[PDB]
Symmetry: C4
Subunit: 118 residues, 4 copies
């Protein structure tokens, strides 16, 4: 029998229950988005809390982050996405950073995972 | 004439107005729960405050604590409950700890008292 | 022309716009309450702020203080009220203190002023 | 491509997106108010934040400041407005300061800009 820790144990959605992610395993999730013709993007924010309202169902605060430059339309190689992450983290070394993708035919995001923590 | 102190004087429900509890007087409240065929349990939480809501009668926040492992079904000797409290005290030396009992025929708790303070 | 200061300038109701009160001028407001057959009392509290509620007219929080021992029924000399203030000042040297009076025929207070500040 | 900074970048309404203001171009915005027959005034406050209410459209908190002495009725030279700003700066060296103007025929303010920051 073992006990799960309730104090100071935050989580960050998908892939947060596995061992930490290495640099190889990161450029295998981008070649899967490129093989299906999706569009990469980047974001950053200094905090991650959630706020509500008294009597309004389905309203939450803290779901929008700030966009780095613009979506990378017409991209074929995975060596540019990896270089943009390094430019992002040299200017803001005290924020979180997250990677997304875009399906343009169904208009919905397809991926999300964290690559940097403060 | 004497004056009761209003500053920094919290209380913790049953048995809090008596002198502090010794190790002998603790293993006399367990032999009374065992003589009536009840089931022991343990809990712990870092805080103890209470919160309310504007216009909802009978709603309070801060009434659930975290359970240690599981209720001790089929227990006859009082030397195991005393050993589990010591295992609980080494993992979390900065929390409160409470002892409970269960009546399975009327479905209601039967006792509660505090054994450790931060 | 001169300017009235808006920063860090609290006030405490009646008699608070006059120069500070000396020990002589304090035992002249008690002989005026005793000449009309009223009953002295004492109070103390650590804070002095006021709160409200969203949509309830005439509700304010922070209007009750704590009472020292009991009202002084049947008191004729002013040397006891002055001695009780000194007993109150040694037990709680970090609170405010107020002096009250009671009219028992119209059931309403008649006086109030501050004698000690933290 | 360049990125606009989202962290710790407050703004103060009109003329805040231009380079900082020198002493020459502070005595050119007053001769424009004097040529149209308007009335100068001054203000100061220690903070600059805004607050709202749950369900009341068009209500905001933090829109009133404190007035220095009085509006300058019948003023023709711009050397008095410049001297009053210096008297205001020695008494309260930890507040913001604003300059206003008044049109008495349409009853509406005509300008506002900041001249001192903490």
């Amino acid at each position: 029998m073992q006990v799960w820790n309730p104090i100071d144990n935050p989580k960050f959605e998908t892939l947060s229950y596995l061992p930490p992610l290495t640099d190889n395993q990161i450029a295998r999730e981008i070649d899967y988005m490129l093989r299906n013709k999706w569009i990469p993007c980047l974001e950053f924010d200094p905090s991650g809390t959630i706020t509500t309202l008294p009597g309004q169902p389905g309203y939450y605060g803290g779901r929008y982050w700030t966009m780095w430059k613009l979506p990378m339309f017409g991209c074929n190689n995975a060596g540019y996405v990896l270089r943009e992450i390094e430019h992002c983290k040299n200017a803001y070394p005290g924020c979180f950073i997250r990677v997304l993708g875009f399906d343009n035919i169904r208009q919905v995001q397809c991926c999300a995972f964290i690559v940097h923590k403060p």
